[PDB]
Coordinates of C-alpha atoms and ligand atoms in Angstrom, one line a residue:
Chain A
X1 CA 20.0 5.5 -9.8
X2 CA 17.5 8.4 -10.3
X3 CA 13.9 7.8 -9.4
X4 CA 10.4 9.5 -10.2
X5 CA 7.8 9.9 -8.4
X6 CA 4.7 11.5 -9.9
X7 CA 1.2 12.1 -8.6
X8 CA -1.4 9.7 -8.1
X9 CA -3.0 9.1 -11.7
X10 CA -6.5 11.6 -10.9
X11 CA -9.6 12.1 -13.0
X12 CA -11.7 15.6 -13.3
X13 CA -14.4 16.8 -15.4
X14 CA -13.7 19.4 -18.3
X15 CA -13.3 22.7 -17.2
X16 CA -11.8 21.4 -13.7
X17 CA -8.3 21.7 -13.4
X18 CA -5.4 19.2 -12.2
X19 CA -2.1 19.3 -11.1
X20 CA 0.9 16.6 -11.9
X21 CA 3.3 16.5 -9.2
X22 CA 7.0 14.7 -10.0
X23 CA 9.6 14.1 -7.2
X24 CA 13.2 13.0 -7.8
X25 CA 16.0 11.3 -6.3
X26 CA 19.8 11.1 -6.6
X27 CA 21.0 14.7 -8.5
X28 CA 19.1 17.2 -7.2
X29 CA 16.3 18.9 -9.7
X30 CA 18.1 22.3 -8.9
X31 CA 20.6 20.7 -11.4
X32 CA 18.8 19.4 -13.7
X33 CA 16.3 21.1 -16.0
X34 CA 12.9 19.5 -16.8
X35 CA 9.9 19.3 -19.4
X36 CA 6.7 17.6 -19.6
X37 CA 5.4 15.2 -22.6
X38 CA 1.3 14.3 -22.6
X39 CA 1.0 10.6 -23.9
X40 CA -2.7 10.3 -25.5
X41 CA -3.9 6.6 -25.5
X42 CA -2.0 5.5 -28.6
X43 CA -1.6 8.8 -30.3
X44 CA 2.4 9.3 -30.0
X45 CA 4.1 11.6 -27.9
X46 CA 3.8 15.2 -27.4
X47 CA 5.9 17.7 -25.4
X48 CA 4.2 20.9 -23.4
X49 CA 6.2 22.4 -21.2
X50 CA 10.1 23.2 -20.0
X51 CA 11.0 24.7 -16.6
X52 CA 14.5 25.2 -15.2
X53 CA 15.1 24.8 -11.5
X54 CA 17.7 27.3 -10.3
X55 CA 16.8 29.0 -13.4
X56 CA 13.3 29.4 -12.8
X57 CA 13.0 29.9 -17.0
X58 CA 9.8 28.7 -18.4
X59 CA 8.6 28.3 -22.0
X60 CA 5.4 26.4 -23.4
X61 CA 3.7 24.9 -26.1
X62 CA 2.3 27.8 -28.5
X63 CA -0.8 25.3 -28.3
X64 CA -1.8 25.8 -24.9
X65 CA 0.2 28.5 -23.9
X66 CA -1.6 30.4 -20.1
X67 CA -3.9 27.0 -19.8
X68 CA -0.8 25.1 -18.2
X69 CA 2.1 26.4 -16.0
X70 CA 5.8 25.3 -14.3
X71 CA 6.2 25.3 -10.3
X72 CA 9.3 23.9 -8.5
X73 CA 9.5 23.5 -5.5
X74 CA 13.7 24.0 -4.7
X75 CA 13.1 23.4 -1.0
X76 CA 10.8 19.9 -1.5
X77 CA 13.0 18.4 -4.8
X78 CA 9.7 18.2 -6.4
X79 CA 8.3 19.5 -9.7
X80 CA 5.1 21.3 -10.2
X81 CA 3.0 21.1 -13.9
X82 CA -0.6 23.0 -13.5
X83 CA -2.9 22.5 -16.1
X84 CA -6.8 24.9 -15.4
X85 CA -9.3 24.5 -17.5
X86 CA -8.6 21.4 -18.9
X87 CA -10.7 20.0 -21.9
X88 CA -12.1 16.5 -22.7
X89 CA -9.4 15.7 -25.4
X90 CA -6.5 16.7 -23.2
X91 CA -6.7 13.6 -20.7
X92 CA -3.4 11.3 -21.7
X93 CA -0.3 10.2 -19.8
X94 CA 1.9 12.7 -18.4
X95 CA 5.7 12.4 -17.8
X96 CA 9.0 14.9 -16.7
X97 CA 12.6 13.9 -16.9
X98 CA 16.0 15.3 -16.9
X99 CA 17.1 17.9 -18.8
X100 CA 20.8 19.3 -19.3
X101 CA 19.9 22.5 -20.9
X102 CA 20.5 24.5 -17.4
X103 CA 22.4 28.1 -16.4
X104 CA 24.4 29.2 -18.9
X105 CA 22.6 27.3 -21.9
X106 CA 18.8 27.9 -21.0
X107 CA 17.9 26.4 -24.4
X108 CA 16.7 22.6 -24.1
X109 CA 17.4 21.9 -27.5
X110 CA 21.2 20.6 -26.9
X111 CA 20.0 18.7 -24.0
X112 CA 18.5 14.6 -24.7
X113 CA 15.9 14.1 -22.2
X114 CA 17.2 11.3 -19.6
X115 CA 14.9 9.1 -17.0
X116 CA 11.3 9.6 -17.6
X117 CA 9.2 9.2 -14.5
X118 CA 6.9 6.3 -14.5
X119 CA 4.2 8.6 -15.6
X120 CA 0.2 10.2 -13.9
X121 CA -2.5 9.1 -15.5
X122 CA -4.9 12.1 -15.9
X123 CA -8.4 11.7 -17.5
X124 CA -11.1 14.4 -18.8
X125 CA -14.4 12.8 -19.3
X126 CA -18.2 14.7 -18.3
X127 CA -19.6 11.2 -17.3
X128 CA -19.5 11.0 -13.0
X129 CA -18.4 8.5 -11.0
X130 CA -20.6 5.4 -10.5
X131 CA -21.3 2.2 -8.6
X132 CA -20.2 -0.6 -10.1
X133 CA -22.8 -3.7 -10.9
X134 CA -21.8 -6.9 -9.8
X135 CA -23.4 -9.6 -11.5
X136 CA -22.6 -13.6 -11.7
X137 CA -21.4 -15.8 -15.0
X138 CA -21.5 -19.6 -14.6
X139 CA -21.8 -22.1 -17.5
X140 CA -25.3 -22.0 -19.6
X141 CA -24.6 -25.6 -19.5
X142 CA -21.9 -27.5 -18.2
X143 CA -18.8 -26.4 -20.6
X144 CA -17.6 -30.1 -20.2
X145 CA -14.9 -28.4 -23.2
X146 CA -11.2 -29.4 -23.5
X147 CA -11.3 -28.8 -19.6
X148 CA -13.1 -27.7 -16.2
X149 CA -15.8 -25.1 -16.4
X150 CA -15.5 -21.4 -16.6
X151 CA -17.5 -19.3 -14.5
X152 CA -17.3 -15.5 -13.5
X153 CA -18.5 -12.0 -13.2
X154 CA -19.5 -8.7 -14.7
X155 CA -19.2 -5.3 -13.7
X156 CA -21.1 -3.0 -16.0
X157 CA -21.8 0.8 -16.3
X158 CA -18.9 1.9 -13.6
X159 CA -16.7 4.7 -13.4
X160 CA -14.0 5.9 -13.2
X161 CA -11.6 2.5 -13.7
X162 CA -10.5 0.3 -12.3
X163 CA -12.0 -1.6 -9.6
X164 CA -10.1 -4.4 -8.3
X165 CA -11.8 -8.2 -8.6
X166 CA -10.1 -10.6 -6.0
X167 CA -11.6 -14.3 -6.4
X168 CA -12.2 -15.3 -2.6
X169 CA -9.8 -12.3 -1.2
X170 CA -7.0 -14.3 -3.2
X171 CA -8.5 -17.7 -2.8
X172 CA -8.7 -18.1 -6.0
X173 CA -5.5 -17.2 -8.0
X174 CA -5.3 -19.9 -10.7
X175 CA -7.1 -19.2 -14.1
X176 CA -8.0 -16.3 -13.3
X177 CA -8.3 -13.6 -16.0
X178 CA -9.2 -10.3 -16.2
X179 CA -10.4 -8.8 -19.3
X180 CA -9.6 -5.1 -20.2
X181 CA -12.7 -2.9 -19.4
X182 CA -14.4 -1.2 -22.8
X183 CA -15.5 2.4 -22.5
X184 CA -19.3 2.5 -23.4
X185 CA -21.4 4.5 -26.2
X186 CA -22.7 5.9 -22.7
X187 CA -19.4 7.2 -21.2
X188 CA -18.9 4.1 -18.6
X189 CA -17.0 1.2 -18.7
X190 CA -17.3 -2.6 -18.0
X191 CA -14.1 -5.5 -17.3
X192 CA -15.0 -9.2 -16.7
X193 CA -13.0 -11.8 -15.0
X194 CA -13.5 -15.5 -15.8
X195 CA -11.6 -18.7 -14.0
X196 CA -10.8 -22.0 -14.9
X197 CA -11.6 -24.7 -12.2
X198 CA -12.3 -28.4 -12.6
X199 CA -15.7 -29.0 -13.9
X200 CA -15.7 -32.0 -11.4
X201 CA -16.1 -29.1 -8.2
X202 CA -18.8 -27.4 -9.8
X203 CA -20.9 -27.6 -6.6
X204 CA -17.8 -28.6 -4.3
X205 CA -16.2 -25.2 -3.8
X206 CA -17.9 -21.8 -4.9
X207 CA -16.6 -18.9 -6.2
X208 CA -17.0 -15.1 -4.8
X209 CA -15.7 -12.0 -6.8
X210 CA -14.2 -9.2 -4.4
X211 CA -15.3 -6.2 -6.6
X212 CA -14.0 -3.4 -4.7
X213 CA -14.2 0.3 -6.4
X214 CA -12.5 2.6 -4.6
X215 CA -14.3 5.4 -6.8
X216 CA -17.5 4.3 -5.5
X217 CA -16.4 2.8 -2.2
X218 CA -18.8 -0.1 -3.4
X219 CA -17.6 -3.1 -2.4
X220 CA -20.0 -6.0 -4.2
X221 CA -19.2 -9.8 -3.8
X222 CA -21.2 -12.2 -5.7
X223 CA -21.8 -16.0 -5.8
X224 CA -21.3 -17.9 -9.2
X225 CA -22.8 -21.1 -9.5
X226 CA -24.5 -23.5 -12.3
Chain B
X1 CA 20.6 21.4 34.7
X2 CA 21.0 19.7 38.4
X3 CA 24.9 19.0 38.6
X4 CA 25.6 17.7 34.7
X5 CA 26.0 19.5 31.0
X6 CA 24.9 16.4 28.4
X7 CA 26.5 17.0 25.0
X8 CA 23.7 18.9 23.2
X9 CA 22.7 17.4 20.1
X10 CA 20.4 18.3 17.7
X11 CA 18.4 18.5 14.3
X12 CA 16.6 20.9 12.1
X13 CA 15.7 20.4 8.7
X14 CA 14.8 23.1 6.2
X15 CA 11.9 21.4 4.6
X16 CA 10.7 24.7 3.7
X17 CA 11.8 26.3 0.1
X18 CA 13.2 29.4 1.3
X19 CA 16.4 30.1 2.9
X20 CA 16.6 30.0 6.8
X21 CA 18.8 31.9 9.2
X22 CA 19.6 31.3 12.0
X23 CA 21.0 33.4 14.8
X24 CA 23.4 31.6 17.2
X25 CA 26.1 32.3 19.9
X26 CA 28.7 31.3 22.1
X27 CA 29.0 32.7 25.8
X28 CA 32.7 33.8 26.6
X29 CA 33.3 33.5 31.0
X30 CA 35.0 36.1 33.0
X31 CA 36.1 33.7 35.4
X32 CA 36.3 29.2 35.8
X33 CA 34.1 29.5 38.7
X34 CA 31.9 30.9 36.1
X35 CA 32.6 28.4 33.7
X36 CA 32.5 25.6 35.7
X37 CA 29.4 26.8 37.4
X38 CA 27.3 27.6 34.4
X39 CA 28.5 25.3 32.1
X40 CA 29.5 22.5 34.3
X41 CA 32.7 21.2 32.4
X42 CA 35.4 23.6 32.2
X43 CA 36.1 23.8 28.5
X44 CA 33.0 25.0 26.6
X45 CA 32.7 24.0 22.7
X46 CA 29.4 25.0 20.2
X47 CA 29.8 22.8 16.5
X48 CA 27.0 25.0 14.5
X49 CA 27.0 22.6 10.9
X50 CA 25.0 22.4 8.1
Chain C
X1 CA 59.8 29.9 6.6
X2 CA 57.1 32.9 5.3
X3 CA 53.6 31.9 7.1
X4 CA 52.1 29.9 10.0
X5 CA 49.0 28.1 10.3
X6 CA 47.6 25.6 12.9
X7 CA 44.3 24.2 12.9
X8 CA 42.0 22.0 15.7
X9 CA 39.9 19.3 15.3
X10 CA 36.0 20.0 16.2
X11 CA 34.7 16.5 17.6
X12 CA 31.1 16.6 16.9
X13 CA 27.8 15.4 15.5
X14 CA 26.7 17.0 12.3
X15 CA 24.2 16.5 9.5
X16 CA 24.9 13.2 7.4
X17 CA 26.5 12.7 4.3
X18 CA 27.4 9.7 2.5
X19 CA 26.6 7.9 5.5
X20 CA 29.4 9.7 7.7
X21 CA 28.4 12.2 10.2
X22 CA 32.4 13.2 9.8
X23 CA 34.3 16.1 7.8
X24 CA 37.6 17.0 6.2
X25 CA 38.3 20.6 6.3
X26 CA 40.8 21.8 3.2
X27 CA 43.6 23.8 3.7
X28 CA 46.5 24.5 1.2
X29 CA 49.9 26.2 1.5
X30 CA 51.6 27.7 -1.2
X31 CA 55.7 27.2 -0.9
X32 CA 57.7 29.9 -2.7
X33 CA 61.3 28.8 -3.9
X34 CA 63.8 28.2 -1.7
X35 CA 61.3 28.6 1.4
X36 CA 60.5 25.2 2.7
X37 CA 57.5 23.3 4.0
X38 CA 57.7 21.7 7.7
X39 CA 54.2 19.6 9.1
X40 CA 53.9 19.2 12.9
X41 CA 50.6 17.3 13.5
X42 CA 49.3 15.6 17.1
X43 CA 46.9 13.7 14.8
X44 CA 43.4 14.1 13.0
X45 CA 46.0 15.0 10.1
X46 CA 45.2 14.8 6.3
X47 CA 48.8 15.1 4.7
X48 CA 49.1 15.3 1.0
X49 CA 51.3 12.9 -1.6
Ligands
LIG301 C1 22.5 33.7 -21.4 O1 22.3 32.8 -20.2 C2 21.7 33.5 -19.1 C3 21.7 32.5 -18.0 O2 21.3 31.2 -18.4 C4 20.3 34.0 -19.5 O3 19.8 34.8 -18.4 C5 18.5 34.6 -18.1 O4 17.7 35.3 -19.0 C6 16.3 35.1 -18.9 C7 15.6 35.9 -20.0 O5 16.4 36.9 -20.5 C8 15.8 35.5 -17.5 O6 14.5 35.0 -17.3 C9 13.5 36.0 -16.9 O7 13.6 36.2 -15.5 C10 12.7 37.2 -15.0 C11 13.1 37.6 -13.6 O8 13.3 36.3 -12.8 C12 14.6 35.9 -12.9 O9 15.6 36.9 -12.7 C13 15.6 37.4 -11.4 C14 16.4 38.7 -11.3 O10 17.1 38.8 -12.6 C15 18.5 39.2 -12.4 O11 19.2 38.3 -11.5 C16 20.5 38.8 -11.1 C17 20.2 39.8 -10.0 O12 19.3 39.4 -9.0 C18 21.3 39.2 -12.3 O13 22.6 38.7 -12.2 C19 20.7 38.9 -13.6 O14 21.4 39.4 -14.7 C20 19.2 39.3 -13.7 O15 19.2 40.7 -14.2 C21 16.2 36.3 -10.4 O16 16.3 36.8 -9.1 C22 15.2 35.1 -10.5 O17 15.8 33.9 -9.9 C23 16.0 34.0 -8.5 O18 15.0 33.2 -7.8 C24 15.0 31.8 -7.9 C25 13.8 31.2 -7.2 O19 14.0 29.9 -6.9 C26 16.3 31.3 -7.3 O20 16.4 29.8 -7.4 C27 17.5 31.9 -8.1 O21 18.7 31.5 -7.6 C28 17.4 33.5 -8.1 O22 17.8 33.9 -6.8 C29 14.8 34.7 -12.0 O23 15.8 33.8 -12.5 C30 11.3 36.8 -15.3 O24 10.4 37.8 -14.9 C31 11.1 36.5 -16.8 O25 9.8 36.0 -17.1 C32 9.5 35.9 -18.5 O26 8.3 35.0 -18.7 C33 7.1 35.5 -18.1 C34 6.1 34.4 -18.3 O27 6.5 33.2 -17.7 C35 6.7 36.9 -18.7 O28 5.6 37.4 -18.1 C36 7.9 37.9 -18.7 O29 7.6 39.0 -19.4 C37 9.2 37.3 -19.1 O30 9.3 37.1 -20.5 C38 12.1 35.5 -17.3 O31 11.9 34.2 -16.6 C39 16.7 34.9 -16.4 O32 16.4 35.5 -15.1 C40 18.2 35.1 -16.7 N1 19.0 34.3 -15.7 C41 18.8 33.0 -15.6 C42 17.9 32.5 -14.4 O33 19.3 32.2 -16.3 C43 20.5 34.9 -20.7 O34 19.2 35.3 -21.2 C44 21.2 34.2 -21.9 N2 21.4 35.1 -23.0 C45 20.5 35.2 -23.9 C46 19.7 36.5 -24.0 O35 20.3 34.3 -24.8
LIG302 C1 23.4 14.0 16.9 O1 22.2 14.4 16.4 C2 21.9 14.0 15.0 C3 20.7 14.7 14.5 O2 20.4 14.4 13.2 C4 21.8 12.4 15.0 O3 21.2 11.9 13.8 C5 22.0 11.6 12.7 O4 21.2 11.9 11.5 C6 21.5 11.0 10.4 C7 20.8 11.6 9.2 O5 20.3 12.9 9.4 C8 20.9 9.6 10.8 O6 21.1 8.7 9.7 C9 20.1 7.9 9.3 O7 20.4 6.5 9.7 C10 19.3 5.6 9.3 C11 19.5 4.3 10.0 O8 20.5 3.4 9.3 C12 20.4 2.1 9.7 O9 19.3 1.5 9.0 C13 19.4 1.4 7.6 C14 18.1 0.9 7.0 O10 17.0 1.6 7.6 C15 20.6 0.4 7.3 O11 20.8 0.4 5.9 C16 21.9 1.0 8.0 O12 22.9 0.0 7.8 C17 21.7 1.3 9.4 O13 21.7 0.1 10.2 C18 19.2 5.5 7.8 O14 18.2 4.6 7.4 C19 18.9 7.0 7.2 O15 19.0 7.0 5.8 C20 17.9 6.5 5.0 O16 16.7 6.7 5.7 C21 16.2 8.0 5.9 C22 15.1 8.0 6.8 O17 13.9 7.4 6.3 C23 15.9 8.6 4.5 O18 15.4 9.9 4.7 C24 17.2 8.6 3.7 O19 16.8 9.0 2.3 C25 17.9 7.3 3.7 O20 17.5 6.4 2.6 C26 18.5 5.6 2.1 O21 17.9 4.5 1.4 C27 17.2 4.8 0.1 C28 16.6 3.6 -0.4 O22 15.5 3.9 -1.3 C29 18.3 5.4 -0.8 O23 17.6 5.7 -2.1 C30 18.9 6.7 -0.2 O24 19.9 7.1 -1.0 C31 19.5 6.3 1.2 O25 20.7 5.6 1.1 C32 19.9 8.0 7.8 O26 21.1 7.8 7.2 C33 21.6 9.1 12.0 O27 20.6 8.5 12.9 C34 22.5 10.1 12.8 N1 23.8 10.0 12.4 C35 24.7 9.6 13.4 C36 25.7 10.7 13.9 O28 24.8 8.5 13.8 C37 23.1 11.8 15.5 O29 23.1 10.4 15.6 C38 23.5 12.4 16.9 N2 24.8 12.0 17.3 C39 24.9 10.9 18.2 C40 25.5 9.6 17.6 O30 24.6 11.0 19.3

């Protein structure tokens, strides 16, 4: 029963620098070595670096060897990955877990990798944040199809993702369906999320999108109606 | 304090990285007047523990 | 029959292990041949098999 805990996923521009932050719990990290492995969208795995706590060793990636660095901090149980100057490709998944490859051994080789933390989400993108637009979706017709009528909303050009939608602060639970947000030829990108209720209550009960973006601090509700 | 000696007790944590030291004591009484006086309860005890 | 040693129990709080704010201090006592072992305890004793 070892747990992770790594940084808030954060977002900077190129050039900028972040800073993944992993706790642990159970056997102390003195104990235990660690390493870091990006995770591009996709792409496969990749590992960067390899620090040893109580060893305080360090050995990186000839790729971007002086661009990232090892902390620990022996005192907090908490591992430290710097990474300055990052560049727009970079941005991926980033992960640390146990290694066994501590004192005497130093190498990491011998040592398989054990509990990876749930991961930070880091992201490298020029494009600034942005206010997310709000607008409503309701049946060119009634849909009178299969079932119901589907009506809702769309947030377009907003960044960085994602902003929560809550149909009538949770009012509206059923149907509901969000689809994943598309990143733009422009650099911003844009969800939807439609519901499914009874074509008979098309004018009975209306339906409000909670679009809150805590990147923007906008907070846009709309009305969707025939 | 006033006329009573409560068992001591307390914490400190070393939330910082770097090793702490602490410098303690324990008083040693001439007399049981002394004692007694100073320390209320005759028999004096200090538990340092980490 | 060689050596002597007594020890006394330190009733107190301390930092929290485990979920006991207790300890168990180890002490071992080597018996050449022929000598022999004797335990005289008033309590708080941890006596080995
Ligand atoms: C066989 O295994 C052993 C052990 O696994 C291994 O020994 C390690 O060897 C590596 C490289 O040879 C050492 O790493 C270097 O450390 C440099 C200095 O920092 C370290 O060493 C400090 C002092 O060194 C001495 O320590 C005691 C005396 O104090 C003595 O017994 C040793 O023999 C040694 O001479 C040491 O104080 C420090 O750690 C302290 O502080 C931490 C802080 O939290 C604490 O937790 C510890 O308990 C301890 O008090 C630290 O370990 C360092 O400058 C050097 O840096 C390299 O990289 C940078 C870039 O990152 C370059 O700029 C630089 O040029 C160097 O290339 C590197 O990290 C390591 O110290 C040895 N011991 C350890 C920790 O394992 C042998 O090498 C193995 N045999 C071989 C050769 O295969
Ligand atoms: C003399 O002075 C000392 C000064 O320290 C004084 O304090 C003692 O300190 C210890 C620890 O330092 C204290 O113990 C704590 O007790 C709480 C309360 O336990 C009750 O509630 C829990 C649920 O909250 C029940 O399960 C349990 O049955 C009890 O009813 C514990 O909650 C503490 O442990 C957890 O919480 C801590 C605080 O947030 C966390 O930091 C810690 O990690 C613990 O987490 C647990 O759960 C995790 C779940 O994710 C798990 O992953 C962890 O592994 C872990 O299990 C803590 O134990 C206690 O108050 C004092 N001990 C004594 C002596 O009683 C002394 O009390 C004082 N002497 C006296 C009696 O006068």
């Amino acid at each position: 029963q070892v747990q992770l805990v790594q940084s808030g996923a954060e977002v900077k521009k190129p050039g900028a620098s972040v800073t993944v932050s992993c706790q642990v719990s159970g056997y102390t990290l003195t104990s235990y070595g660690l390493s870091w492995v990006r995770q591009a969208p996709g792409q496969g795995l990749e590992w960067v670096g390899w620090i040893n706590t109580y060893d305080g060793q360090t050995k990186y990636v000839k790729k971007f060897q002086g661009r990232v660095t090892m902390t620990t901090h022996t005192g907090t149980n908490t591992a430290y990955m710097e990474m300055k100057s990052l560049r727009s490709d970079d941005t991926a998944v980033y992960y640390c877990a146990r290694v066994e490859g501590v004192r005497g051994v130093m190498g990491f080789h011998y040592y398989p990798m054990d509990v990876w933390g749930q991961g930070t989400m880091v992201t490298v993108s020029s494009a600034s944040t942005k206010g997310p637009s709000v607008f409503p979706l309701a049946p060119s017709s009634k849909s009178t199809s299969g079932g119901t009528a589907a009506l809702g909303c769309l947030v377009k050009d907003y960044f960085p993702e994602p902003v929560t939608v809550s149909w009538n602060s949770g009012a509206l639970t059923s149907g509901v369906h969000t689809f994943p947000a598309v990143l733009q030829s422009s650099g911003l990108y844009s969800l939807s999320s439609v519901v499914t209720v009874p074509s008979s209550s098309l004018g009975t009960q209306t339906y409000i999108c909670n679009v809150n973006h805590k990147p923007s601090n906008t907070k846009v509700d709309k009305k969707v109606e025939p | 304090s006033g006329s009573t000696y409560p068992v001591l007790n307390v914490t400190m944590p070393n939330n910082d990285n770097f090793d702490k030291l602490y410098i303690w004591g324990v008083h040693h009484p001439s007399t049981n007047q002394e004692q007694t006086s100073l320390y209320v309860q005759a028999s004096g005890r200090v538990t340092v523990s980490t | 029959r060689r050596s002597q040693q007594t020890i006394i129990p330190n009733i107190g709080s301390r930092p929290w292990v485990r979920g006991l704010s207790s300890r168990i201090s180890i002490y071992w006592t080597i018996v050449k041949p022929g000598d022999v072992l004797v335990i005289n305890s008033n309590g708080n004793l941890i006596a080995p098999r």
